[PDB]
Structures are given as C-alpha cells and as structure tokens.
C-alpha cells in the first residue's frame, strides 16, 4: 500500500521546496504536498504496465514480404520472380516498433518471432492450395539461397521452420547481439574510411530469414504474404533518449526527409489562449 | 560555510576553479571507473597513462553571437590532437574513457541568455539529404573545432537544424540526456562528468564516438545596451579513468 | 494418450499473449551483459525527468523560439501564457511526458510544471502561475485565475519555480487523448507585479517551461501512438 499523497497542512517556513535551479540539470521531486494542502491518498498502483519488459514485450509486425508459388521453368534468378524472398532481420523497417525501441540507446532482449503466412489467388484458380512455407534463419556467413529449391534449403545447420499457409509459425531466438546490447544508435563507422557507411552497424544485426513455398507449383499462381511479428522478451534497456519526432526515411539511419511538416502543433490563438 | 557555487576540479596538472557553478552532473549517477575483470574480453593488459592523459584539455573558444544556433563536439574525437591522449588514441586499437566536460560562458549581471549543455550517448547524426544518405567520416569527426550548427549544409555532412537535434528528435526532449544549463543569470559554468557508456567494454576510439557534447543557446543572448553582442564559450574536457589496449602502429584516419 | 478438449481461441495469435516457445538456437550462449549506466526498468522513472514545453507554438515552423515564453516590461495584471492541460495534445504532445503518455490510454496523478527565468540577474519579476481545475473556463483576468490553485513566484537568486498540478479527477484516471469528461483543466501565468528590467537593458526576457510527472503518476492501457506513421516499409 504505497502512499500517493500525504496529508499536509498550512506551512509558513524558510524551507521552500518549490524554488530550485534547473541549471543544475536535476529535477527536484516536488510533491503536491509541497505547495498545496493535501490529504492522504494511496497509489493502488505498482507501475507494472510501464515496465520496459511490458512496454517492449508485445508482438509488433516487423516485416511484410511476399513469396509466390509459381512454375519456375525458364526463370533466371528466382528472387526477382518472388519464388523465394530473404529478409535481413531488423526492427526498424516498420516504424511503430522502431519508435518504441529508439526511446533507448541500448537494448537487450531475447526475441520471439511469430510468422503468419496468408495466401491469395488473384486470378483463375479452381481451388486454394494447401501450401507449406519454409522460413530458414540465415546467419551472416551462411550460403544464401539463389534458387527456391537449391542445396541451401536442406538447412543442416541453419534453423528452419515448416508451417502451413493460413497457420502461423512461432519460435524464440536468444539475444544474438555480438555486444552486450543491441545498438539502436551507432555514432560511428565500421572502420576509419572516407566513404564507409555511417550508423549502419552489425551491432544490431539479428540474422536473416529466407522464405519459400516448399510446394512445387499448381496450374494457378499463389501469392503468399509473410508477416513476421516480433516480441521482445527479457528486455533490458539503457540510456533513455529523446523520442522520434520526424518521419523516418531508412533502416538504421536517423535521417528525416527534407521539407517535412512541423511536428509541434501551431496554436490557433496566441500564447495566452486555451 | 562552503558554497555549492565555488567548485574546484583538479585532474592531473590541470585545475579548474569556478565561483558561479551549478551542481555538477554525473551522468546516470555513475562516476567513471576502470574496466573490471568480470566485464573484460580483450586479454591485453591495458595501459592507464593516468596523469598524462587524464587532465583538462581546453578546446578552441566559440563566440556566441546572438544568432548562434549551437555547437556539437564528439568525444573522443574532439581530443584526438590533444597531447598524449591524442597520441594514445591513434597508437592503440582500443580505448575507453570517461570525461569531465566543463563549459565556460561568463557574463555580466546585465546579460541574459541560456545555454543547454547536453551530453548525448551515441548521437547518430542525420544527413541533410534524407533517404539512405550517410554522413562522411570527416564531418562526424571535426576534432577541436566541432560542428557549428549555424553553418550551412555541406555535401556529405550532417543536417544542422538545431530544433531537431541533428537526428530527428526535438530540442526540448534533450533533457532526458544528462545536461546542465548555463543560465547567465545563475551560473557561468556547466560541469558534466561522463562515464564510459558503450555496449562493449572497450572500443575503437577513431571509428566511433561514444558521446557527443552539444552546447545549444535556448534563450538567445541579449547583451546590455552598447555592449559587445558576443560572448565567448570555452569547452574544457578532461578524460577520466582512461584505458588503452592493443598497442600497434599509428592509425591513419581520413583528413 | 491424454484425452483433451480444444477450446475457443485455439491457434489464434494474440499478439500480447506471453507464452513459452521453442528456441531456434539450442545451447546458444549469449554475450555476457557488462555494466552499462542508465538502465531503465520502468517508463515512470524517465517521465519524472523534466523536459521543455513548446508553449510558444505560435509560429508556422518548429524553432527554438517555440520553447521561449516572452515576458514584457511595462505589464501589470496581464497574462503571460495560457494552455489547456490535455497532456497528449497541444503544447504537451511533443514533450517527453506527452510522448510516453501517448503510448497509454489512461493517466492519473500529479503533473510537475517548472518555469525557468532566463532574464538578467538585475531584473526582477513576480509572476502568478494558476492551475484552474475543470468545470470552469480558462481564466481571463488574473482575478479568476488566483481563485484556483496558484503559486506566486518571486524571481530572485533561484530562477526556477516548480508548480505542481494536483490531481482533480474522481474519475480515477483521465484519458491521454483529449476527452471533455476527463479534461484536466487549465494552466496560466499572470504578471503578479510586473517585469522590471535594469538600466541599459531593453526588450523581452524569456521563460522556459518544463513538464514532468510527480511520483504519484500512473499510466495504463498501453496503446499505439499518433506521433509516428508510415506509408511504405523502410529499406536499407
């Protein structure tokens, strides 16, 4: 039973809690009982939902891609034909989880992926096909798939998950960061070079996923859309940051677009208005 | 008795006095410390060149000229030419350092104006082009001169709009980072003590900036009538608990 | 074989359910957690940090003057500023309090409002910061402002007043979204005496307004925010 407000009466004193100096960079914990006469109230509240494992720990959509089950005879590279699709795993392509994560500089969490696959036949199908998706977790250095059915999909050491379309996949991935936390922000470079990329680092590299329909093909085409949902768990967060105000433009960069809209709402009246 | 305004910081053979200070900020209430054995991964015995590098290095003074937008310095980049600390930064593969950052701006009781002196860990700068354009190495590594935020955009450089903190956030929300104000009414001095803040125990000091120091005028400089419409701002930075590991040849950076 | 019955909601993906799932990486040993300063366990920790309010959002562009509340010399009894206290809207929408408040639907507890005087040290001002609890309008003359919760602020060697907004909502939480039933009331500053400037100094001096949360502050019913948006997925 935490006290929210103490009972305070009239004070006429030299102890003045409500005068301070913001120059010191501190926020004085000034209570309501410091400047008005209060009564005793209780919190009845523990702050469990603003906990960072509750805050970062529900499933956000992080990626939507499409793969096609299709006749592959006479197709050059099979990735432009969407016969398979690889996704470099990041939590910054879709901005709703990105803004929550980038409230912190460093974050460490075990991941928990939920992959939903949904099909559609936009033209001339007699039936909806019972399809199976392979989601192969591809770490950096693994051979990337170049065909939808090459040797890489054997996955003797890569983690794969088979699941039906319409059904969903679910697997947790541990914290796979090389450092003690992921870098949401990286003020630097991979090396001392005049042309190397800024901010794009392997310190938030989480692996990659490769997706294909494992079925061969039917007479009609099937468009399978994959929706990876990420839930962070065992979340640890460091260095709270200023929240994002402007729209993002790219993965891994703090860039904002040119000639953007003002984010502070202009008041209708003057500074005196309500 | 003793004032909270009269402070002395002695580091090495360097001393800073102030008689118009605020209370010094220790970032996240953590004093700089050497790397303990339980956190270390690098197996080299680190060199701790204590009084020769952990000492105050005064940077070039900035003139705050009533239309100034602000100034950003990068650490350890602002101290890459500063004595033995600058040399150990290039001869070693690795290094970790905390900082005492001290910012000076004196004025008369007739002056007004307020500086935001803020320390931002991993201040990843935005490009002025948007999209996926990166900032070149020489622009996030300016050294002693820092980044003048009132200067124009240069191709390959960061965006210099002070309202968006050069990173797409807002200026008012920088106070979540460890900061002080130099309000000329109250203090002429901002003192911020920074620990080593990184996801790694020790890191490359030349390709990575751990923290940035931004000195931002919030309330503009109003000088009294007939006075010089300019105040010098001096930034004095001392490394603290500085380790260096992996000694090799002197690394050549872009300049 | 155990006879089981399958319930409703079987095979559903509730995105907020917190279950155990198989690991794709058995026997993986993650990187040792080193000590990093500034660990956050709870967002109620960091909304007790005061951040600047853009009270002067009277421009057509985001600028530093939006954070600057102007004071003027020869002014008795007038209003310095006024605002409503919808903390997920208005001047508060972009502050750190208001950004984290917009991830939640309900808020309770007391606000912490700071003003920082930034004029010259030989200037003097007395201001009166009024909180009007809801039911009445936004005050119009300083006479109806001081009938509510107010602090008279003499400006001297300490440049910062800290006015709390005490909690007025028997409906135990309010909405973070602007809702008329759960309006928090009005905030206004008035010239108590006036701003007196020293000789050889002219013009305006500025106030800096800060907002934070008291430790009795509550947030619940986590929701998506209206701040960030997206048309297409971002690329590398």
């Amino acid at each position, epitope marked *: 039973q935490t006290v929210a407000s103490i009972s305070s009466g009239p004070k006429h004193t030299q102890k003045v809690p409500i005068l301070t100096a913001n120059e010191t960079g501190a926020t004085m914990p000034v209570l309501p009982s410091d400047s008005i006469e209060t009564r005793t109230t209780y919190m009845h509240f523990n702050g469990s939902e603003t906990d960072v494992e509750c805050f970062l720990g529900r499933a956000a959509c992080v990626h939507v891609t499409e793969i096609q089950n299709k006749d592959a005879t006479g197709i050059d590279n099979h990735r432009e034909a969407k016969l398979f699709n690889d996704w470099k795993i990041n939590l910054s392509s879709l901005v709703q989880l990105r803004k929550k994560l980038e409230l912190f500089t460093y974050v460490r969490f075990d991941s928990e992926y939920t992959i939903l696959a949904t099909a559609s036949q936009p033209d001339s199908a007699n039936y909806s096909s019972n399809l199976v998706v392979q989601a192969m977790y591809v770490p950096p250095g693994a051979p990337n798939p170049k065909e939808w059915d090459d040797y890489t999909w054997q996955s003797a050491s890569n983690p794969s998950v088979f699941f039906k379309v319409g059904d969903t996949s679910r697997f947790s991935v541990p914290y796979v960061g090389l450092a003690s936390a992921y870098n949401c922000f990286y003020d630097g470079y991979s090396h001392d070079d005049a042309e190397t990329q800024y901010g794009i680092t392997v310190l938030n590299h989480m692996g990659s996923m490769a997706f294909r329909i494992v079925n061969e093909h039917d007479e009609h085409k099937t468009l399978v859309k994959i929706r990876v949902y990420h839930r962070a768990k065992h979340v640890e967060a460091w260095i709270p940051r200023a929240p994002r105000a402007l729209p993002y433009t790219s993965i891994g960069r703090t860039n904002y677009p040119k000639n953007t809209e003002p984010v502070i709402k202009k008041r209708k009246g003057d500074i005196k208005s309500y | 008795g003793y004032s909270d305004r009269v402070q002395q910081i002695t580091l090495g053979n360097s001393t800073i006095t102030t008689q118009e200070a605020a209370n010094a900020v220790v970032c996240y209430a953590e004093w700089p410390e050497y790397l303990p054995d339980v956190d270390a991964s690098d197996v080299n015995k680190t060199s701790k060149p204590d009084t020769s590098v952990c000492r105050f290095y005064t940077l070039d003074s900035k003139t705050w000229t009533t239309g100034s937008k602000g100034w950003c310095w990068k650490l350890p980049d602002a101290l890459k030419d500063m004595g033995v600390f600058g040399q150990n930064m290039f001869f070693h593969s690795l290094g970790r350092s905390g900082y005492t950052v001290h910012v000076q701006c004196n004025a008369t009781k007739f002056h007004s104006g307020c500086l935001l002196v803020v320390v931002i860990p991993e201040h990843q700068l935005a490009s002025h082009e948007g999209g996926n354009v990166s900032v070149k190495y020489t622009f996030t590594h300016p050294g002693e001169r820092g980044i003048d935020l009132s200067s124009a955009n240069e191709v390959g450089g960061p965006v210099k709009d002070v309202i968006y903190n050069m990173n797409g956030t807002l200026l008012g929300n920088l106070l979540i980072f460890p900061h002080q104000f130099i309000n000329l009414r109250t203090n002429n001095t901002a003192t911020i003590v920074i620990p080593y803040i990184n996801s790694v125990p020790i890191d490359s000091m030349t390709r990575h900036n751990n923290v940035s120091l931004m000195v931002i005028p919030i309330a503009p400089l*109003t000088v009294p009538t007939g006075a010089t419409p300019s105040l010098p701002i001096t930034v004095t930075i001392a490394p603290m608990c500085t380790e260096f590991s992996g000694i090799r040849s002197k690394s050549i950076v872009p300049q | 074989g155990l006879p089981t019955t399958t319930l409703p909601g079987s095979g559903q993906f509730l995105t907020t359910d917190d279950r155990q799932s198989p690991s794709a990486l058995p026997n993986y040993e993650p990187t040792p957690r080193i000590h990093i300063p500034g660990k956050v366990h709870n967002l109620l920790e960091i909304i007790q940090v005061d951040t600047l309010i853009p009270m002067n959002n009277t421009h*057509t*562009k985001d600028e530093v003057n939006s954070y600057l509340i*102007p004071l003027n010399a*020869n002014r008795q009894n007038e*209003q310095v500023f006024g605002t409503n206290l919808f903390i997920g809207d208005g001047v508060f929408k972009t502050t750190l309090l208001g950004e984290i408040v917009q991830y939640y639907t309900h808020w309770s507890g007391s606000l912490r409002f700071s003003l920082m005087y930034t004029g010259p040290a030989l200037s003097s001002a007395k201001l009166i910061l009024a909180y009007t609890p809801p039911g009445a309008r936004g005050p119009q*003359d300083r006479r109806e402002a001081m009938l509510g919760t107010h602090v008279v602020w003499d400006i001297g060697l300490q440049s910062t007043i800290v006015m709390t907004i005490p909690w007025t909502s028997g409906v135990q939480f309010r909405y973070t979204d602007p809702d008329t039933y759960t309006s928090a009331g009005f905030l206004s500053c008035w010239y108590q005496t006036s701003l007196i400037l020293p000789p050889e100094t*002219t*013009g*305006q001096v500025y106030l800096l307004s800060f907002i934070s949360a008291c430790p009795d502050f509550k947030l619940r019913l986590m929701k998506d925010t209206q701040t960030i948006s997206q048309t297409v997925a971002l690329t590398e």
Partner: antibody
Amino acid sequence: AVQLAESGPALVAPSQALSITCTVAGFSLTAYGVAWVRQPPGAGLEWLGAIWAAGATDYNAALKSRASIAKDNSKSQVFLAMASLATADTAAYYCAREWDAYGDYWGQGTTVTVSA
Amino acid sequence: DIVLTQSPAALSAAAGATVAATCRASGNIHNALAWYQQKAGKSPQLLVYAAAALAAGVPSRFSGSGSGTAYALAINSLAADDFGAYYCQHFWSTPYTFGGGTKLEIK
C-alpha cells in the same frame, strides 16, 4: 468578428485636444491591448502608442508629453487624447488589437485635420 | 530607441518579378518584426509576423527572412494585388517604431 471602429471629431482647431475613440467589438480590453498608429497623407506610418491589456501604457518617445491613452473596459472604448496640436498632426489614425504583441485588425481609420 | 531603416523608398516592377524589401535595425530585434501591406486609401494589413511567419489569409508569395538587425521581405512572382506601400515595425519592448516605407509601383 474582431472590429475596432475609430471615431473622431475630424475637424479640430490647433492647440486643442483630441477625443478619438475606438469602440471595440469581438474581444474584451481586459484581455487584449490596443495600439494607436497615425499616417499623415503622403508620409508613412507612425506608432503613437499602445495601451496594454491592463491599463499600462507606452507612447512614442517624441509624443510622450502630448499623447495620453486611456480605456474603459466595461464600455469597450479606448481613448486617444493628444494635447497642444500642431499642423503636422493631420493624419488618419488607426487602432489595432494586439496579436502576439503585434498590431493587426486595423480599423478603417478616421482622418483628422488640424487647421484653422 | 530602435530606428528601423527601410530601403529603398520606391521599387517599380511589373507583375511576375522577384522583389525584396529590406529593413536594417539599429539594435537586435530578435525577430520581433512585423511587415505591413497598405494599399491606396486602405488600412494596413499584417503580412509577416515574427519576421518569417505569414499571417492569416496571406498568400504564399510573401516570405520574410533575416535575423538580428537585417530583415528581408521577398515576393515571388508579383501579382496585381501586391502593389502598395510596405512597412516594417519592430516589437522589441517599446517604442514600436516603423520603417520609412517601400512603395511598389508599376513599370
């Protein structure tokens, strides 16, 4: 509808007093101040003075001895009184509601001719 | 006091040109400057407040710029409605003195 309607005698003998009024509609004088600006024909605008939202007044530095601005908050009338007129006071006089302390909502203006 | 020196006295131009009127102040206004449009025999109309921000119902041809003591009012592609006399006024405490005035004429 924020309106500031000037009204004056418009024909004043020199070395006399002005009694130029602005009846205020659309706002209250307790909340917004009123600026006064004249413009002689051919020449440019001259700021005469401002009464602020609670009766504090500021004036043109060359006309502090002549001009005096007062108001009635209940009658919504702001008064401009210029004593000891000269022939260079022939001007169309304007009122303005204050708007971020800037003057706008300028009235139609009444021309005053100071002649004998 | 603060003297506003507005320059030049007159600028004759045709419809569709780029015209900049300039006010130089004796002291720093800190962007507390207003630009006014006055047509022939009409009340002054506020175009730009805070030296850069367009007022209510002002077309986007007008653009205020400048800071400190120097301030510019630029018009892109003059229309026929944009002719008349233009005035600065600063608002830095008091007195709120005007500039001299720029009259826009037709070639």
